């Protein structure tokens, strides 16, 4: 029954004014990529930074189990695109946000599937 909720702890830590997790690995790239959220190579566009995925995953970074049976990580071995205005806290961004399963884009940050 008991389970440590690390996402909640990090979000509360951020609200208390805590320093976001550092040393997320930012990649060099052309910034003319598709802009999709999680990719096999860096895909940042003009408004994004690309990061090594493992370094942006709260569970990888904190050495705790991944919050699912199977224990699989969506980020490790991949690249995560972060809006440049949010790239100060890539771990927080990936936690607080969701990828559209139709188009690969972050909902709220590139997904336009809800448009007329």
């Amino acid at each position: 029954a008991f389970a440590v909720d690390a996402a909640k702890a990090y979000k509360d830590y951020l609200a208390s004014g805590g320093q976001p997790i550092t040393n997320c690995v930012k990649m060099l790239c052309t910034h003319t990529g598709t802009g999709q959220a999680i990719t096999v190579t860096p895909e940042a566009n003009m408004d994004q930074e690309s990061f090594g995925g493992a370094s942006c995953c709260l569970y990888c970074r904190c050495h705790i189990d991944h919050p699912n049976p199977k224990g699989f990580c969506d980020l490790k071995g991949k690249y995560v695109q972060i809006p440049t205005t949010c790239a100060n806290d890539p771990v927080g961004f990936t936690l607080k946000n969701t990828v559209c399963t139709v188009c690969g884009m972050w909902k709220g940050y590139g997904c336009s599937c809800d448009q007329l």
């Binding site: 040393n23 690995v25 990649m27 060099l28 930074e49 370094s55």
Partner: protein
């Protein structure tokens, strides 16, 4: 000159041919720093420039390429160079990495422990090492050939590098090994490559291009390291980040290099010719199995 727009500078052949005496390395640009792009780690920039330079060599790039990366951790607890290698290598390349200390990685598999505990059933197409012991950086002691992880690397190249494979092994003024230089003669070509972002350091990557499994030329490693220090001592390299801003042709081109399982008898001169050209890998193509020896204690 135009060197500032290169990823770095490779040891010119004429310096390889010298017979210098070992001297203290005293770099003119020591203490200078390159202006890195905003928010970019030194080792991301450094591995990017190493891969940009590797793009100019005749690397064998098979399907299901096998790459192993030693010394991949950092005091940050992450693996910047592994992320760059993962970006550089074709999708589907198997990337294994390793370090003495624990870290989180984007590699397909990660072994924690001394490199001397690592064993692999299979052979590899590319070996990258950034292993370094800061204790070697001691100007008050004679600069002798170093053992430790360098002894492991030399054995690992001779036992587990596929014919036609390539290596990039980080050295410094004091972090070096004479047998590793001697092993460079068992490749079709070799160099010491200095990245432009870290050109104020005696760091280079010893690059053996296309492994041949036997001495092509005899290299004295004490003399060759002295040759390398002499080159660095007399050729100031201007620090440069320029090449980091052009990533359009960064990915390693998936060449589909042939992989064949040949026994020592069938390796004739025509086979060695194909190895030397980046056009053949010789190894088995079974499954990749690795392990790390655990010492059990009370």
């Amino acid at each position: 000159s135009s060197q500032a727009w290169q990823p770095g500078v490779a040891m010119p052949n004429l310096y390889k041919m010298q017979r210098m005496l070992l001297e203290k390395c005293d770099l003119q640009n020591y203490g200078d720093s390159a202006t890195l792009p905003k928010g970019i780690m030194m080792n991301v920039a450094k591995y990017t420039q190493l891969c940009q330079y590797l793009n100019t060599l005749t690397l064998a790039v098979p399907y299901n390429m096998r790459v192993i990366h030693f010394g991949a951790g950092s005091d940050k607890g992450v693996a910047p160079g592994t992320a760059v290698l993962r970006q550089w290598l074709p999708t589907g390349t198997l990337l294994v990495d390793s370090d003495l200390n624990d870290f989180v990685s984007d590699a397909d598999s990660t072994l924690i422990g001394d490199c001397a505990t690592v064993h692999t059933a299979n052979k590899w197409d590319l070996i990258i090492s950034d292993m370094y012991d800061p204790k070697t950086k001691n100007v008050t002691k004679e600069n002798d050939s170093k053992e430790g992880f360098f002894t492991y690397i030399c054995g690992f190249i001779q036992q587990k590098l596929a014919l036609g494979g390539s290596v990039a092994i980080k050295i410094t003024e004091h972090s070096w090994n004479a047998d590793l230089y001697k092993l460079m003669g068992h490749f079709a070509w070799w160099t010491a490559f200095v990245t432009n972002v870290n050109a104020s350091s005696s760091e280079a990557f010893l690059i053996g291009c296309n492994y041949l499994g036997k001495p092509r030329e005899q290299i004295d490693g004490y003399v060759m390291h002295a040759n390398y220090i002499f080159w660095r001592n007399t050729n100031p390299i201007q620090l440069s980040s320029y090449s980091l801003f052009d990533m359009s042709k960064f990915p390693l081109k998936l060449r589909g290099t042939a992989v064949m399982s040949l026994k020592e008898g069938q390796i004739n001169d025509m086979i060695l010719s194909l190895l030397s050209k980046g056009r053949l890998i010789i190894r088995e193509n079974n499954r990749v199995v690795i392990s790390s020896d655990v010492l059990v204690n009370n």
